[PDB]
Design a protein around this nucleic acid. Structure first.
Length: 404
RNA sequence: GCCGAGGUAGCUCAGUUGGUAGAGCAUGCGACUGAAAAUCGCAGUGUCGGCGGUUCGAUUCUGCUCCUCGGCAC
């Protein structure tokens, strides 16, 4: 192509330019907004915590969210503004999706970190979709989303609530130790790290509970100094969820906060929403079968769910109707006998009709049992025995008169 | 980035030693039922992944690509 139009804009090409048809379809999909989409939950699920938990100044929260931003970011943005050196590994063409040499599809939300600073925000969140060209397996995929967050602080406030003897210039000419920026102070550092570590420890528990195995491991980031990587154990093996550290000053000073300090952090909604929901193969996140997108109904974000596998095989539906016996009979009783008699491979049951006979005045119910194996395709003959093993069981043990 | 397996009716797949293709589950009408299910009778469906190539003729053979799945690995 001579050019490529993405969002009311067309971009030239070159040996950098490498966007595939496949990938491209996705862009603008903005999944972290399909409301009842796991990814979105984690957004308010996280948007909320911060709303309640923090509010600097009056009733205006300090963490102002941005959930709809242009993935198509310049280059200076995604790399340069974050002090990322030239020829740095992560600038490999076969890792990033470039439109042209100077414009690409943000590899990380950390790309906006600079603009927002410059602007005026001193505290914010950015939830979006990002791309990274790579494999496609259980835990990796062309496209995913990130929730990034950032907070700054005032020199007369970082400390403040301290034995008010202001002999604490939030930063000097020291030196970069594996523990602080050459232009930072231990007291200042140790604090925000606490806040950053703090805010995060707090935020996690809120989401997961307080029975989560979590630790910090030291790491590296071109745009943060003390860098830590929050990992979370579950299933027996420790998994990872985010990246964070204080903010690199140069980065800040360059922007519009020559006299401030702060921390940044961005997490992977797929990662979180995967443990928090027991969805194993990231890919599923792009499934459309009701059997999926719905498992995440709930009238409350903070509510919890536990992914039901979901077999991609022919289902074999049968119906069973019976007249109800007076006085004793509750729905959940019949839902268990089904799940008891030939259960384990039922997937779903629905009440498809409540008929109150006009003359006998006896009630009838019609349940729709959706048989469906997870490994093979089930035959009518294989099933029926099960269904039948419920017709002569539903009677005896439930006290119904079987319309069959 | 590399190595292997594949893209065929809604879903899962089989087949044609090359002459435009099926089985199970699902779907539609009839009977039965207040309405269903099961049951019995009848029926339908696919540009057989996209582009070229060998051949009288390809979904079946070759060459490329796109996509999917898996295994190794940056």
């Amino acid at each position: 192509g001579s050019v490529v139009e993405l969002l009311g804009k067309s971009y030239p090409q070159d040996d950098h330019s490498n966007l595939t048809r496949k990938v491209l379809t996705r862009v603008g999909r903005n999944l972290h907004n399909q409301q009842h989409h796991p990814l979105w939950l984690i957004k308010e699920r996280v948007k909320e915590h911060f709303y309640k938990q923090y509010v600097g100044r009056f009733g205006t929260p300090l963490f102002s969210v941005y959930d709809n931003l242009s993935p198509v970011v310049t280059t200076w943005q995604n790399f340069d503004s974050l002090l990322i050196p030239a020829d740095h590994p992560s600038r490999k063409k076969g890792d990033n999706y470039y439109l042209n040499r100077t414009h690409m599809l943000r590899a990380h939300t950390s790309a906006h970190q600079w603009d927002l600073l410059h602007a005026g925000l001193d505290a914010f969140l950015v939830v979006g979709d990002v791309y990274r060209r790579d494999q496609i397996d259980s835990q990796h995929y062309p496209i995913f989303h990130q929730l990034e967050a950032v907070r700054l602080f005032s020199k007369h406030e970082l400390f403040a609530g301290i034995k008010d003897g202001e002999s604490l210039q939030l930063f000097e000419q020291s030196s970069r130790s594996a523990h602080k920026q050459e232009t930072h102070t231990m007291e200042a550092v140790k604090l925000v790290e606490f806040d950053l570590k703090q805010t995060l420890t707090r935020l996690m528990a809120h989401l997961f509970g307080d029975e989560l195995e979590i630790r910090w491991v030291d790491c590296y980031f071109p745009f943060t100094h003390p860098s830590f990587e929050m990992e979370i154990n579950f299933h027996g093996e420790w998994l990872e969820v985010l990246g964070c550290g204080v903010m690199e000053q140069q980065l800040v000073n360059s922007a519009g906060a020559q006299d401030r300090i702060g921390w940044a952090f961005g997490l992977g909604l797929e990662r979180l929403a995967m443990i928090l929901y027991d969805i194993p193969d990231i890919r599923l996140f792009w499934c459309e079968d009701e059997r999926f997108l719905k498992q995440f109904c709930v009238s409350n974000i903070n509510q919890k769910v536990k992914f039901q596998p979901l077999s991609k095989y022919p289902a074999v539906i049968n119906d069973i109707s019976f007249w109800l016996p007076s006085e004793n009979y509750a729905e959940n009783d019949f839902y268990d006998l089904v799940r008891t008699i030939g259960g384990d491979l039922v997937e779903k049951v629905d009440l498809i009709d409540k008929f109150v006979h006009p003359k006998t005045h006896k009630t009838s119910h019609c349940y729709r049992i959706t048989y469906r194996h997870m490994e093979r395709t089930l035959s009518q003959r294989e099933v029926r025995h099960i269904h039948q093993a419920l017709q002569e069981a539903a009677v005896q043990l439930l006290g119904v008169e079987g319309r069959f």
